[PDB]
Ligand binder design. Structure first.
Ligand SMILES: [Mg+2]
Ligand SMILES: [Mg+2]
Ligand SMILES: [Mg+2]
Ligand SMILES: [Mg+2]
Ligand SMILES: [Mg+2]
Ligand SMILES: [Mg+2]
Ligand SMILES: [Mg+2]
Ligand SMILES: [Mg+2]
Ligand SMILES: [Mg+2]
Ligand SMILES: [Mg+2]
Ligand SMILES: [Mg+2]
Ligand SMILES: [Mg+2]
Ligand SMILES: [Mg+2]
Ligand SMILES: [Mg+2]
Ligand SMILES: [Mg+2]
Ligand SMILES: [Mg+2]
Ligand SMILES: [Mg+2]
Ligand SMILES: [Mg+2]
Ligand SMILES: [Mg+2]
Ligand SMILES: [Mg+2]
Ligand SMILES: [Mg+2]
Ligand SMILES: [Mg+2]
Ligand SMILES: [Mg+2]
Ligand SMILES: [Mg+2]
Ligand SMILES: [Mg+2]
Ligand SMILES: [Mg+2]
Ligand SMILES: [Mg+2]
Ligand SMILES: [Mg+2]
Ligand SMILES: [Mg+2]
Ligand SMILES: [Mg+2]
Ligand SMILES: [Mg+2]
Ligand SMILES: [Mg+2]
Ligand SMILES: [Mg+2]
Ligand SMILES: [Mg+2]
Ligand SMILES: [Mg+2]
Ligand SMILES: [Mg+2]
Ligand SMILES: [Mg+2]
Ligand SMILES: [Mg+2]
Ligand SMILES: [Mg+2]
Ligand SMILES: [Mg+2]
Ligand SMILES: [Mg+2]
Ligand SMILES: [Zn+2]
Lengths: 86, 122, 134, 50, 52, 52
RNA sequence: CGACUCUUAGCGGUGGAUCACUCGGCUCGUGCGUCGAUGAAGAACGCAGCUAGCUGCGAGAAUUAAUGUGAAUUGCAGGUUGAUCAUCGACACUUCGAACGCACUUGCGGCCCCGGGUUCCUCCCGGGGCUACGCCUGUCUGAGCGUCGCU
RNA sequence: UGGUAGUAGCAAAUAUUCAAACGAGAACUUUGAAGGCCGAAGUGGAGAAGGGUUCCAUGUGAACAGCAGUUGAACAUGGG
RNA sequence: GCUAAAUACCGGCACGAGACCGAUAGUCAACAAGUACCGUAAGGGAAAGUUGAAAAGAACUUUGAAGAGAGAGUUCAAGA
RNA sequence: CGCGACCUCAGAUCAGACGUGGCGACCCGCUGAAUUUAAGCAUAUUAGUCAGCGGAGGAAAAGAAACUAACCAGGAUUCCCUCAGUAACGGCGAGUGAACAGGGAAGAGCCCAGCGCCGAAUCCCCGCCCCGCGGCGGGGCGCGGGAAAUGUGGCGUACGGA
């Protein structure tokens, strides 16, 4: 009964979706995330999995504010000035 | 017709508000027409009304914030949103006045021994 | 040969910049040469194609001396449609055949306030260039 | 489960709205290579995770 | 397995030397950069000797 | 909220609201049933706001 | 003759090998070399007339304002005193997330000020602004059979 | 991509028959009749976990439901 | 206790080039790719480019319910 | 008993600020193996390397001798060639392995504590007025508040200084 019959008792999930990383790895009993460590203030990151690091980096997602900062840099972060009107 | 922002800035706040609500009413009834199922004229006009609403809100916000910073132009402590939003490192950087401050020791050192302009014959 | 190190000579990059150019660059790229009368009048060799210009066809199956007005400028396909350069479909409906602006000669310009100032600027630039030559 | 949480129900809502087929007018575009929606999900083949 | 006759060698390649190797493919570029900085310095101090 | 829906309907259409029952559809949007006061008639309100 | 099997050729079925194309990679080099509590990276959810993915965007939601340019976008409808694109310095930018009123079900609060009730008389509803830890300077409130001076 | 090979097999839990209807086509859908089974610790009626639109109606029969299907927990439209 | 310069750069922005690779090659990824998909999780992780100059994407007739054929027509070419 | 100071420690949704986290190719500090080699293997080797943790910058670190030399002496730090696969370390086995001088790139020097001398001659904050303010500063008025004598500022630091 080690195999197929044992597989019939899968009816209570262990992990749920994390509210920080978005992956389904937030352990309920441990109350911690196995993908990014949500309760820990520092993002889980190890150098022995380069692929895992690359899957979620600075350039992976939207870069909602950073890409705006990139195009502001080429003008030197101007503030308070507008082009002359017609 | 085609509402544009050039003639909206001169309008006062209450008139802009009493135009914005009418735009909201027209957008709502256009949405009702879309759900019921009508001609493509209302469907096309939905985008126009939404952009007109966006442009009116933009003008209202620009005038409001311009008046706010005009009010806080001369004061020493100004609200954070009105403060210049540059990079965090640049804000934490010392200002030109502080970085230009020079102690009396190096002031008199430069006084007594300035960098001269010299040349040597071949 | 080109000497500016900030201008590409790579085939792949040039093709990418051509097939992904924005519409305001598509307008400048899709420019047609002016007629001999037009160039000797306005001193301009070529101009961007517009919606309401009378043009001919120089190369292709529809080439000839007949004059037709453009009806629309389909800049997405690098194509313009002419007044009577068209063919029938299977069902009998007539649809225009795309013609590249490179094989189109402008006969009469639909000059406007902006069109006139563009021509004057181009004429001025080429006149000062010729004067600088000698 | 009939006792769905708000976040899970919202997640299922998005997946259901994503599961609809591609409209028939899109594949008439010029720069189009989408012959069909390849990311369709069926409740008997893929269990969506969770 | 040494051959019949020859030197005994002790190469220092037993570490992971490939991970830390410096290549001089930027040598002419660095020469030009030094030259441009040197000329820029020379024109900055207009009457002063270039060598300092 | 149900109170917000009741107040919004009252201000937008000048009709008294008896009660509100709200559910969230499987598509994500919230469907709200607005039971009006006995004086008003839903048929008249519907045909004067557009839906018919 | 016939049927079947074997060898070759023609043609017809797979199957995409070779060849030619390449808006893609790899490498070298150059200049620059900037994230974040004024809320980063990331994640979630939404936004198109017809829209799934991608891309873009954030309730102003395939974008607003301004500037440059100057007659389009386009798969189908619809409507020069500036359509579309590019630039982008003004405005705005939902929910989690170092995430910050407590925990993470999105529940339960507290304080102050407004609008509905009242006509401040207390509830109740809606709206607006604060309530995370550590830590520097100053301010206030303090405590000590700590050191004191006077009665 | 071949020989195997149109082969192995499509044999756990008694069982189907008749007439009509739609339909181009029926051993398989629907109706009616008959004969049966589960036999109230059920092949019944309702929950929790789990799944997430599989629930309902119409249309299609391209692909799947190891035969076929006028049927579907299939596909497309709209609801709930 | 402070201090530029010459020095390092496989992260990032914008660039130029190649005695390199040419879709089983080259980054895993030339395409809706760290996507689909599997594992509870850490993680693992693909296949997949070529109509035509222009869709001009085959009007119309004929058998069949249709898949799909026989004519006809577009194209220099449907032996695209 | 009380009042008023000083000192140590609290509470503040007190006024004004700062740190939190991310990328992490390059850099700084710490921790840190086993594969492998030695034809086995324990010292060694792999190796101050991988893995792990912390902290930044546009570069970082280092840096102006408690130096190198023993010559007729040089003179901050850093990087290239060379010294050199050398001195040297090593079950003296496998193997490991610098530095000085020399030629270049660059080249820039300095500041406190202490000893002292000047009425704390110093500095911070809040109120008001003027000027420009999208790197909140300059001038003036406050018997305004505070820090500081348990030491601020000027002269001044090994090359002498007063
Ligand atoms: Mg468990
Ligand atoms: Mg870490
Ligand atoms: Mg001093
Ligand atoms: Mg040039
Ligand atoms: Mg031998
Ligand atoms: Mg020199
Ligand atoms: Mg930085
Ligand atoms: Mg949508
Ligand atoms: Mg605009
Ligand atoms: Mg404009
Ligand atoms: Mg609970
Ligand atoms: Mg058989
Ligand atoms: Mg069976
Ligand atoms: Mg039941
Ligand atoms: Mg059903
Ligand atoms: Mg079957
Ligand atoms: Mg230092
Ligand atoms: Mg070259
Ligand atoms: Mg391929
Ligand atoms: Mg091939
Ligand atoms: Mg490949
Ligand atoms: Mg292939
Ligand atoms: Mg092919
Ligand atoms: Mg091929
Ligand atoms: Mg041929
Ligand atoms: Mg061919
Ligand atoms: Mg405070
Ligand atoms: Mg940090
Ligand atoms: Mg060994
Ligand atoms: Mg061995
Ligand atoms: Mg051994
Ligand atoms: Mg050792
Ligand atoms: Mg060691
Ligand atoms: Mg060590
Ligand atoms: Mg490491
Ligand atoms: Mg430093
Ligand atoms: Mg010294
Ligand atoms: Mg030295
Ligand atoms: Mg060693
Ligand atoms: Mg030396
Ligand atoms: Mg002193
Ligand atoms: Zn997580």
């Amino acid at each position: 009964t080690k195999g197929t019959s044992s597989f019939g008792k899968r009816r209570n999930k262990t992990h749920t979706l994390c509210r920080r990383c978005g992956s389904k790895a937030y352990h309920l009993q441990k109350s911690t995330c196995g993908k990014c460590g949500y309760p820990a203030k520092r993002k889980r990151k190890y150098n022995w999995s380069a692929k895992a690091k690359r899957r979620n980096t600075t350039g992976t997602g939207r870069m909602r504010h950073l890409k705006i900062v990139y195009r502001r840099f080429r003008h030197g972060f101007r503030e308070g000035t507008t082009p002359k009107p017609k | 017709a085609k509402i544009k922002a050039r003639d909206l800035r001169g309008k006062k706040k209450e008139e802009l508000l009493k135009q914005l609500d009418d735009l909201k009413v027209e957008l709502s009834q256009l949405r009702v027409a879309k759900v019921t199922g009508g001609a493509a004229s209302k469907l096309s006009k939905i985008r126009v009304v939404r952009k007109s609403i966006a442009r009116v809100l933009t003008v209202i916000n620009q005038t409001q914030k311009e008046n706010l910073r005009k009010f806080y132009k001369g004061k020493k402590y100004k609200p954070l949103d009105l403060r210049p939003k540059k990079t965090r490192a640049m804000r934490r950087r010392l200002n030109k006045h502080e970085e230009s401050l020079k102690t009396k020791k190096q002031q008199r050192k430069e006084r007594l021994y300035p960098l001269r302009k010299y040349a040597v014959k071949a | 040969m080109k000497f500016n190190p900030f201008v590409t000579s790579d085939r792949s990059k040039n093709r990418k910049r051509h097939f992904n150019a924005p519409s305001h660059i598509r307008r400048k790229i899709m420019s047609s040469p002016l007629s001999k009368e037009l160039r000797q009048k306005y001193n301009v060799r070529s101009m961007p194609i517009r919606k309401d210009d009378e043009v001919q066809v120089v190369r292709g199956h529809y080439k000839g001396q007949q004059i037709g007005k453009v009806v629309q400028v389909y800049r997405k396909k690098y194509v313009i449609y002419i007044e009577r350069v068209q063919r029938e479909k299977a069902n009998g409906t007539t649809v225009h055949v795309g013609i590249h602006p490179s094989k189109v000669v402008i006969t009469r310009l639909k000059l406007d306030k902006d069109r006139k100032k563009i021509l004057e600027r181009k004429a001025k630039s080429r006149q000062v260039g010729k004067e600088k030559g000698k | 489960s009939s006792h769905k949480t708000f976040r899970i129900k919202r997640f299922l809502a998005k997946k259901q709205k994503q599961n609809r087929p591609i409209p028939q007018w899109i594949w008439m575009k010029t720069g189009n290579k989408i012959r069909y929606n390849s990311k369709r999900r069926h409740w008997r083949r893929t269990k969506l995770g969770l | 397995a040494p051959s019949r006759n020859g030197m005994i060698l002790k190469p220092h390649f037993h570490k992971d030397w490939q991970r830390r190797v410096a290549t001089w493919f930027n040598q002419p570029a660095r020469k030009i950069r030094r030259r441009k900085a040197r000329q820029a310095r020379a024109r900055r101090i207009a009457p002063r000797p270039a060598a300092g | 909220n149900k109170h917000q829906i009741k107040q919004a309907v009252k201000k937008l259409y000048d009709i008294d609201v008896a009660k509100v029952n709200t559910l969230i559809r499987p598509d994500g949007e919230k469907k709200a049933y607005v039971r009006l006061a006995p004086d008003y008639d839903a048929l008249d309100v519907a045909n004067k706001i557009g839906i018919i």
